[PDB]
Amino acid sequence: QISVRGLAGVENVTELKKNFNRHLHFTLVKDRNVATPRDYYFALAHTVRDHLVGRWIRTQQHYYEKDPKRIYYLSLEFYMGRTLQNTMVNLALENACDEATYQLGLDMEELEEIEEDAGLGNGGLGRLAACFLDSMATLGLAAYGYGIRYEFGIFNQKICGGWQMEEADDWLRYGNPWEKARPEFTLPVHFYGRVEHTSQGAKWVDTQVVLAMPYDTPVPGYRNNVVNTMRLWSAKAPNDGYIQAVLDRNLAENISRVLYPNDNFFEGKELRLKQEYFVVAATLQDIIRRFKSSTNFDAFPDKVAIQLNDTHPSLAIPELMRVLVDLERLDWDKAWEVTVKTCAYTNHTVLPEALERWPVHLLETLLPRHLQIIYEINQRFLNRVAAAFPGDVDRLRRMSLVEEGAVKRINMAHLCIAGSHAVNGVARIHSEILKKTIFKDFYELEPHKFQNKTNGITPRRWLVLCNPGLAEIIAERIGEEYISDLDQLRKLLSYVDDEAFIRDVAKVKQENKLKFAAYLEREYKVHINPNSLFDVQVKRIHEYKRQLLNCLHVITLYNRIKKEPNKFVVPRTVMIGGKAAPGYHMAKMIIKLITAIGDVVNHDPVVGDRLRVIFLENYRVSLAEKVIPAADLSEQISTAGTEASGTGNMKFMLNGALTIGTMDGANVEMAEEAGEENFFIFGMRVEDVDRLDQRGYNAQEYYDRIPELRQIIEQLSSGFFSPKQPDLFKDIVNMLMHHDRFKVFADYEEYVKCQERVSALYKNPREWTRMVIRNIATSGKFSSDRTIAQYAREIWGVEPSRQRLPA
Amino acid sequence: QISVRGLAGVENVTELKKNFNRHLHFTLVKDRNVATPRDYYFALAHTVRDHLVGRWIRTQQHYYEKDPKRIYYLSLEFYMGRTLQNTMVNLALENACDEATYQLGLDMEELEEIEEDAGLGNGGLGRLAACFLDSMATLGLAAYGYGIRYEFGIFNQKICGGWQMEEADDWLRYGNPWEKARPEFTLPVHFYGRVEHTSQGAKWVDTQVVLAMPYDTPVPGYRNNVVNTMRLWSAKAPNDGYIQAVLDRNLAENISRVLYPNDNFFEGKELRLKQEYFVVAATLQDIIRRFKSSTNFDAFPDKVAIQLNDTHPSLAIPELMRVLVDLERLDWDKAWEVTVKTCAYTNHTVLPEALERWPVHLLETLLPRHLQIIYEINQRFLNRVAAAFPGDVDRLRRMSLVEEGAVKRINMAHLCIAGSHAVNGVARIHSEILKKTIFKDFYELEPHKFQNKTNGITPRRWLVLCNPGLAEIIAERIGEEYISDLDQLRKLLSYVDDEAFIRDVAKVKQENKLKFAAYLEREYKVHINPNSLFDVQVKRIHEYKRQLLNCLHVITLYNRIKKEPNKFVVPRTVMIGGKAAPGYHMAKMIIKLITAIGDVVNHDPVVGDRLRVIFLENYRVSLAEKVIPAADLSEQISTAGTEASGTGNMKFMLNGALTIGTMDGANVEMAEEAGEENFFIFGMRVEDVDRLDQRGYNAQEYYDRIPELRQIIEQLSSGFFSPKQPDLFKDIVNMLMHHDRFKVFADYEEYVKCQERVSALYKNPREWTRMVIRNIATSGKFSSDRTIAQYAREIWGVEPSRQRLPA
Numbered sequence A, B: 001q002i003s004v005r006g007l008a009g010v011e012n013v014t015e016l017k018k019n020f021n022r023h024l025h026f027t028l029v030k031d032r033n034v035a036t037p038r039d040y041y042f043a044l045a046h047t048v049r050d051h052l053v054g055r056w057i058r059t060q061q062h063y064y065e066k067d068p069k070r071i072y073y074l075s076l077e078f079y080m081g082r083t084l085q086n087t088m089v090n091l092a093l094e095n096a097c098d099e100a101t102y103q104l105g106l107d108m109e110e111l112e113e114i115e116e117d118a119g120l121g122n123g124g125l126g127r128l129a130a131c132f133l134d135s136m137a138t139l140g141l142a143a144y145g146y147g148i149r150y151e152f153g154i155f156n157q158k159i160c161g162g163w164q165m166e167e168a169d170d171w172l173r174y175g176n177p178w179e180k181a182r183p184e185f186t187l188p189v190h191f192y193g194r195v196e197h198t199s200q201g202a203k204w205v206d207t208q209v210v211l212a213m214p215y216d217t218p219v220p221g222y223r224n225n226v227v228n229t230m231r232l233w234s235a236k237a238p239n240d241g242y243i244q245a246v247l248d249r250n251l252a253e254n255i256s257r258v259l260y261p262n263d264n265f266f267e268g269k270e271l272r273l274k275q276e277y278f279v280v281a282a283t284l285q286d287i288i289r290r291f292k293s294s295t296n297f298d299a300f301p302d303k304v305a306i307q308l309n310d311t312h313p314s315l316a317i318p319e320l321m322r323v324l325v326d327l328e329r330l331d332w333d334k335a336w337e338v339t340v341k342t343c344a345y346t347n348h349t350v351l352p353e354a355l356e357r358w359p360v361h362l363l364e365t366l367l368p369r370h371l372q373i374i375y376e377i378n379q380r381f382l383n384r385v386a387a388a389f390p391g392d393v394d395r396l397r398r399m400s401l402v403e404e405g406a407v408k409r410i411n412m413a414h415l416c417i418a419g420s421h422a423v424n425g426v427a428r429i430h431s432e433i434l435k436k437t438i439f440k441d442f443y444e445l446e447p448h449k450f451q452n453k454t455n456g457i458t459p460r461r462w463l464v465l466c467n468p469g470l471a472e473i474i475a476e477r478i479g480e481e482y483i484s485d486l487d488q489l490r491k492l493l494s495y496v497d498d499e500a501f502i503r504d505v506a507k508v509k510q511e512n513k514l515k516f517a518a519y520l521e522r523e524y525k526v527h528i529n530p531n532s533l534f535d536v537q538v539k540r541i542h543e544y545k546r547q548l549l550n551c552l553h554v555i556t557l558y559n560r561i562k563k564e565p566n567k568f569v570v571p572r573t574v575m576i577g578g579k580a581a582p583g584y585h586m587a588k589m590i591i592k593l594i595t596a597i598g599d600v601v602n603h604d605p606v607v608g609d610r611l612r613v614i615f616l617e618n619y620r621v622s623l624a625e626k627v628i629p630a631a632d633l634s635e636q637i638s639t640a641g642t643e644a645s646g647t648g649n650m651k652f653m654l655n656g657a658l659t660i661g662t663m664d665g666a667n668v669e670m671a672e673e674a675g676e677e678n679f680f681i682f683g684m685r686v687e688d689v690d691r692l693d694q695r696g697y698n699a700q701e702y703y704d705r706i707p708e709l710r711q712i713i714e715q716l717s718s719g720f721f722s723p724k725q726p727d728l729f730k731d732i733v734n735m736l737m738h739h740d741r742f743k744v745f746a747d748y749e750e751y752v753k754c755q756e757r758v759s760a761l762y763k764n765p766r767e768w769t770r771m772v773i774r775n776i777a778t779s780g781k782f783s784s785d786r787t788i789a790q791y792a793r794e795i796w797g798v799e800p801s802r803q804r805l806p807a
């Protein structure tokens, strides 16, 4: 049907059709009279998968022959989403498969909907890893994603009586066609034991062994025939009364059982520490094995880069030391040199509660040798600080890897900085925050180490895949090359006064909104006005992301309508979605508040279809692909200084929504690229937040001086939104009035006024759309291809390449 | 190379070769430069598997169209062994695959050795089910094997310092290519809860749900294009703080985790009871579903037979009642009629310690509704007994399903007899023992119910597959038809005086012995004389099987040699193998004794290579396939009355070993078929055992009157076979002298004398071989095709058929 989806060549359609029937028969062991849509999905998946195989084997043997520097991206999270469409798009097979399936009497879109999200991540951090893998393959880098194959990913969210319920995400139920088990490359990982000092050196003995079994998933580049590998480790018990011994194997296998859902919040659980060491230990053995298969580790950093994502794989540093010193018998200083030059650290958040500080007594029991190594690292590091800042004893305690207190802890961030040749934040303002406040001491010691790498999103998944209509009308004007060179979208500025283009942009959006409005009615039995402004806030539920500020605005619009029912207001559908961590009580109350507001607003006859409030259940990657293309307004309203980057923001910008946001994270750079005129900026800057903290934040002051705000609080306290439970939202009110770390009231007035300017512009369709065009056209910077090219050149020391391998 | 292995057609060899390379590339994702033998095994397995698919789908749709009566064989054990060679043999693909693999530079025998045994059984009971499935497919019956897919089968046995060590049998480690997961046919199974009585009737509520997920394995008939199904259930947790809830899913999934290894010994564990109900509940739903997909259950017994193997699936009876009464709303009497006519019960052992007697308090908690139903069954059954034997109150308590005592128990055997239209034993003498002693009361009440079905073995696995040399020389004389009509082997009697045949028989044996002697040196680093008589006892280690009696003989030969070193004796290699249940201390001591005897005998310079004692480690189906064809003497020496049938006995007879045995189980019928002249029979008959029990067995009497026996006991007690631990075998000596339930001493003299007659005949090769020919030639009765044809006609009410389906 459309250009970007590739060719539907007769011979290719014929081959696809026959391989589809082959898989249905020989792989699924079904006939067409008993097959269900799920069987058809799997037959298609196997048919598409076959096309990866040759390229995957060729790519990997190519890396063996040429022996480039290898990039190892270590993360506890990879939020991959669905793989089928992505693979089709990247192999140029989408229209052919569409045609082939159509000719067999099947709707391919329907089969695509059967695939489960691979939800091996919480949100932005996990999704960044997924976008990054796509970009690394597209840029021809010899890159491996390494993580854990969780049996259960991020929980499925059900809303019951307005409350979040968590259900196990049993994503492997029907099998995963995209993974290849590699039980032959299983490696041992050690835990517990104790350290023995011999004449030869230290020795870690009496350990409990857990096996790490790899599963490889292919990562196809965009139309370059490169297929890289994501290797995820699964925990297996070694083979060495009777019945119970067999059942106790589960204890070891529990390591890879479930993803911790407590995003941006450190809890210090032992099982999580085991997960972290598990991924690190197996990965480094694999890395070393691959390096040796080409005594001398001098060239190790020329052939290996290890990128640490947050502190979660920070044990890579002492593990690499352990292997080099205890097993390879390198001297400490040489080992350290190799380690530092091999490792680099990316910080993704400065929220204090997210910082990993592991109790020493835990490390002592679980990883006794690693604690010894960390102590040694600390002593040599502080000697360097002492020599550079003589007499500065408070600096010494501030920079130490060891924190003193009732319980001694190890600060994993400090460890990462010490053992890495580069440290980066993920947006300019965040990286500056690192140098100025959080890691100031370290920046003063080693300024050369600190960098910025502003985040990005992949334009394959986040434009071509999820918004084919938009990708097509753009390709009509400027061709297809932008898909792997997103800066080319700048060429769209010369169409900002083009009447046909303005019409096309607005048509694509309207179609996306109709499609999404239909999804709502069909799959969730709820009606919305598709001519309303689609006001969307989708992200994890957290106080810092200030879903509550959005709630206050919604209640304000509602009270205004009730006060003057017969005045015109721009109709809105306000959509809020996202998951709360299971033990985050305040986040769960916020969800309940949103649904409660919806209960009142959506059933008030006076309001009509002028204001609707929907909580989008089970927000996840597959749902983001549907809602983001349908959005008019993107809510990016975190308190300045708290969102390190954000990436949802970028997705919305690329897909034709306008942004209302604070000058936080990557929003700053988005406003800078599009022009501040083309961005709905409001609220405190970081500097204002600091000024207010020095003075003391008093919420009461705002309650006293803003009647509209006062009314909302009184409605909350009195039970207006909770008739049968008048005091249900007391915790929320109390938090807002007395212990709001994120200053919701401080931005309320400017937010509401800024929202009025949004409504004003939406009344002028032509000027709305022209501003949209200016956003889309300047979104090029926020491609993960740009981000990864920067990592490659400035951190890993490798050159990206768009040259294709032979098919 | 050889006839029986089928055609190596050029076009077939070409197709096999290309599908092999296709699977290596697309399925295994390897190239020939990195592939290992294991990869080659899997490529071959996938290539062969492809040939089953069309036949499997065709067979099952054929059963749908014609709608024959369906046979459901319920067992907790299926000891399948390896599947690759069996599938090749049954599809006539063996030489083609041999040729195809040879042409790719691969040895097929080497790849066959890589396949793991499916060890989902303990021994003879599990193996009988496997043989039976093969025969049912070969006889064109619409038959399903139903059981549990254990994650861990029978443990791997390692011998350490002469002691058995158990290792988890992680048989699914590398995947199982022969199973197809069918997660779409997953069914709920209920546990716990309580019973609620309404106006409508009884209702079982507040249950915990476990999901039963089927895995289907194909069961190919012999060259008839029939492929039946073995469906094995796996336990899954349903999808409905947080971390721990996810980890606790393991509790539900533990149901299908491990096979209970306590063969012929009831322990009364709850997890085992859960396994039994799990298989029964899922299976019956599946059965009913299939029946409805063709209100009126009158025709249920015309379309369904359920064969219960031992009492392990005895809950099928009250479960079927529960479904018919509580869910389908049939009246009790009609439900009962349907149940009785649907179910049949096979008893496989009369050892008292093997009898399942479940504590009422267990059933009460776990399966409250089933206990109510069992009580009702009991009351109506005893009313029938009372009316037939008025006044006979002791009969009432003897026949009751409920046993009184400190703990009340349910006798599952009594339940089975009551709820089945047929009850059979597994060899003539055993079935007579059922009528005369164990189930006498029930036989008097319902004599028509009691039958015999003498066991059999499949001649495919147990001749063609494991002994191709023998199958070939037989086929040269009488053609190939005997392979599915084993009675034809009678034709070999007319070759008993044929000199070429005698030479061929003895040549095949000698080659088998050389091959097995090589296996010993290669895979276990031990040397044996291949010209010695191969004296073999392989079966589970149990007191009733009297491995100890064999040990006494071995020690007797040793002492005789030491007493007269320079006299000639027929050289022997004495081989004993088998697993002991982990908690069966006496069985573990017996293993240790065997290895200890080996330590003394095998290193005594005076003995030379005239006597060797080897314990065969990890006896299992794949090892039986190697050792049985190499055996000269088959030890079947259980105390008369204890081995219900035996099946190893039959395997040996078919493969050219002579039998030394008691008149126990199927040995009686084997001697009857071959002629007692052609069988080394010795020892007490059942009648003699009974006479001795009435009088009181006094072992001391034998110790007093047999000096050779006295010497052996004194050697045992004094520490001759345990120098560093003089008292190591005190328990054995004490048991033999004071509490030997199996009368080892009572058969010692006759056993030793009978063993001298064996040696005498072995000195005359020509007459040995002629006696062998008379055994092989009369082994036809012991085909499982005969057994299954008898079940079909006399129990299930269906006609077997050798007619082929279209390929």
Ligand SMILES: O=C(/N=C1/NC(=O)[C@]2(O[C@H](CO)[C@@H](O)[C@H](O)[C@H]2O)S1)c1ccc2ccccc2c1
Binding pocket: A122, A123, A124, A125, A126, A128, A260, A261, A262, A263, A264, A265, A266, A267, A310, A348, A349, A354, A426, A455, A643, A644, A645, A646, A647, A665
């Ligand atoms: O940092 C974490 N989560 C993040 N999620 C994000 O979305 C963050 O990374 C993105 C990618 O750089 C940024 O765009 C977001 O602003 C930032 O919040 S950081 C985090 C921290 C501690 C955790 C502990 C247990 C489990 C998950 C955790 C995740």
Ligand SMILES: O=C(/N=C1/NC(=O)[C@]2(O[C@H](CO)[C@@H](O)[C@H](O)[C@H]2O)S1)c1ccc2ccccc2c1
Binding pocket: B122, B123, B124, B125, B126, B128, B260, B261, B262, B263, B264, B265, B266, B267, B310, B348, B349, B354, B426, B455, B643, B644, B645, B646, B647, B665
């Ligand atoms: O009966 C059992 N085992 C048998 N094993 C056999 O080999 C038996 O069946 C064969 C097939 O009919 C007969 O040939 C054997 O003589 C008989 O011992 S019966 C048995 C009994 C209780 C069990 C409890 C837990 C686990 C396994 C069990 C097996």
Ligand SMILES: *Cc1c(COP(=O)(O)O)cnc(C)c1O
Binding pocket: A122, A123, A124, A127, A538, A539, A540, A619, A620, A621, A624, A645, A646, A647, A648, A649, A651
């Ligand atoms: C992009 C994305 C995120 C991150 O969104 P932010 O608004 O930057 O927090 C979270 N979840 C999913 C499913 C995503 O696709």
Ligand SMILES: *Cc1c(COP(=O)(O)O)cnc(C)c1O
Binding pocket: B122, B123, B124, B127, B538, B539, B540, B619, B620, B621, B624, B645, B646, B647, B648, B649, B651
């Ligand atoms: C046939 C067989 C058995 C049963 O042997 P008996 O001598 O009848 O106890 C046990 N185990 C295996 C592996 C078998 O093949």
